[PDB]
């Protein structure tokens, strides 16, 4: 009956599938050239901007409001700093939205403006996955791309405003499970979560 249990049990296949896409397998080594890492940083920028715009839009929506943690979870500012480091101050005038990302961005804007009960799916899959790895992936990328130990370029992977990940995860669980959702909506969230993973891998599968 619990949403977190439904998610956990009903997306293991897609979650394990995601955690060894071509790009990810290389990363846990570490591998990947700077130019692929910069592209992934570019793509992640646009998708997180989209998602965090919609999450703010539905800040006071009953189905989402308890999961709204801008200061603790949002990455647009971290990704912004990272883009600044690689591309420079006018990074926004240089890069463009890649086309696998724009498919996902279009999905997120639809969900955000028509079915905000399903934002939970995109937020759960993104931020809990990120909060999980962060501290480890950060060090692999620094070592692999010779980035400054001071943090420049890997701010995306750093959750400065979260004292303990596993304790915060439990809060997020309880807030998620305390959402006033019927069983039907919970199954649709699980389906939309699997789509979140689908969207994610096909982004990462593209130079
Ligand atoms: Cl770094």
From Swiss-Prot:
Localization in the cell: Microsome membrane; Endoplasmic reticulum membrane
A GO CC annotation given for this chain: endoplasmic reticulum membrane
Molecular function terms, GO-annotated: heme binding; heme oxygenase (decyclizing) activity; metal ion binding
Enzyme Commission code(s) on record: 1.14.14.18
Residues on Cytoplasmic side: 1-207
Marked site: Important for catalytic activity: 130
Residues annotated as binding heme b: 15, 124, 169, 173
Notes on activation and inhibition: Inhibited by metalloporphyrins such as Sn- and Zn-protoporphyrins.
Keywords attached to this entry: Acetylation, Endoplasmic reticulum, Heme, Iron, Membrane, Metal-binding, Microsome, Oxidoreductase, Phosphoprotein, Repeat, S-nitrosylation, Transmembrane, Transmembrane helix
Membrane topology of this protein: Single-pass type IV membrane protein
Posttranslational modification: A soluble form arises by proteolytic removal of the membrane anchor. S-nitrosylated by BLVRB.
UniProt KW Transmembrane helix keyword: yes
Catalytic reactions of this protein: heme b + 3 reduced [NADPH--hemoprotein reductase] + 3 O2 = biliverdin IXalpha + CO + Fe(2+) + 3 oxidized [NADPH--hemoprotein reductase] + 3 H2O + H(+)
GO biological process entries: heme catabolic process; heme oxidation; response to hypoxia; response to oxidative stress
Family from the record: Belongs to the heme oxygenase family.
Protein name: Heme oxygenase 2
Species lineage: Eukaryota, Metazoa, Chordata, Craniata, Vertebrata
From-to range in the entire protein, with total length: 31 to 237 of 316
